[PDB]
Amino acid sequence: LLEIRNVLLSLLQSHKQLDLSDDLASFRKYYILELLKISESFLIVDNLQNAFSVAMLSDALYRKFDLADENLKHDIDFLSSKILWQRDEKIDAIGMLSESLSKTNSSIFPSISYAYLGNWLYTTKSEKTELVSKNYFEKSLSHMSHLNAKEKAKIYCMFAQFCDNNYSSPDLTEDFKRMEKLYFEKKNDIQQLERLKNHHSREMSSFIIDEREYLRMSTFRSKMLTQSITHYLKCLSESDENDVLISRCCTMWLSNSHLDELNNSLQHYLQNLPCKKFIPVFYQLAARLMNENSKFQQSLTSICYNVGRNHPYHSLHVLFSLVSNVPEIENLDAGSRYRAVKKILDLLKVNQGLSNLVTKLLCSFENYVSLAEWNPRSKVDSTSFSRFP
């Protein structure tokens, strides 16, 4: 793209004595584009040597031909960091990151960027989880909306990834199971203590105090997992890139079914989330709806009813199939659930134009259903509409 573009910049430098202003020297400094000049994926030789060559002159821009200080420090910083991530500068990236952390010349959005390096550290596992978690969370929350276009995805991602690892991870899962077993043993211990020596009771109480802290931490982290699912839904609201977000959301409601108490934690955000984006999820999620005065079931029903009114036709295949999948044989709690599901479909069919649409869907189902049932006279390939009634 840019062969002599640096050589192009050379000229404004050349007229130094006659220069109107040195702001032209400040021009090539704001060189985020100059980094982009190869940073846009020089694939053939894989975009390696150029940018590292670039940001060196960026440091020169900081110093060699300019005496100034600004966010551009952290700017060349995150870029060198990206180059480092390109080539195994394992903590060297962390080193530049901490260096950026040291100064104070920009807005807190650079700290939001620094949360990316902090999560890179979470991969590196340099320090304790809670402190760096607070360090990233404070900057993410404080100056929010100062950036949006690329800010939302990473803002969700940092709050989500480590927390979800906390929700489950092989060693972490084993640890949570061991803690749960400890709580279970403490339950039987308290049962025995219900009805001699108070020393064992006091030791068990101390162990119970210790275990209750860990259980409360895991439960608050799981509530944080619900909140991160909500933030990922808000991410689906800000942008529609990630169906991986969709599957993670699906896991969230699946555990909500598993976790009968978590629904309150999931309650309020479920109000605002436009799940219309969850098209690939839609049939499964609708099937997940249940028939009870339970918050999860009610929220599912409201979401599906919203789906129908807003745009049934996209998933009206799914809803019309669910209705079309009308077995009288299947008898269980799902039976009354599907009866109330038909009730909810009729409730969604209240609106007059929507009523016409729903009747059209049901009649088309009836038509194709008779068509399938129509196996008459072993007729030839061509079928006339008059053959069926």
């Binding site: 991986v244 599957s247 699906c250 896991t251 699946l254 499964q284 072993s378």
Partner: protein
Amino acid sequence: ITGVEGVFRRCMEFTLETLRREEDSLLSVLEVLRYDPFSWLISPLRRMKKQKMQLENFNQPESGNITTDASRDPKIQRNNVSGESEAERAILKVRQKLSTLSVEASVGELIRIAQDPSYLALMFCGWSAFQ
């Protein structure tokens, strides 16, 4: 010009490339729906229906004993019951398929039996076509 390769090898080089982009992706997608009672199992009645069976890979119409016994039935039991969900068993299989074996070896893994005469000996009876 080419033997079965090249652009084929290109698609091979594509083949395992997905996992690095997001290992979790395909799993999470499948499993999320897998959590809700699918029938991740094979109906024994449906089993006898498939492989053309009958007397030909592509037998004629209706035919005999109406369609090889209106080939139909249903009801499982203790035997060969998938434990909780063999999809959970499947989930491990996918990552196993998605697992020190060389990425380059994967195409060879496909290649190793691709032109192997041995496999062609055992398959669905009838309908064997090398070229």
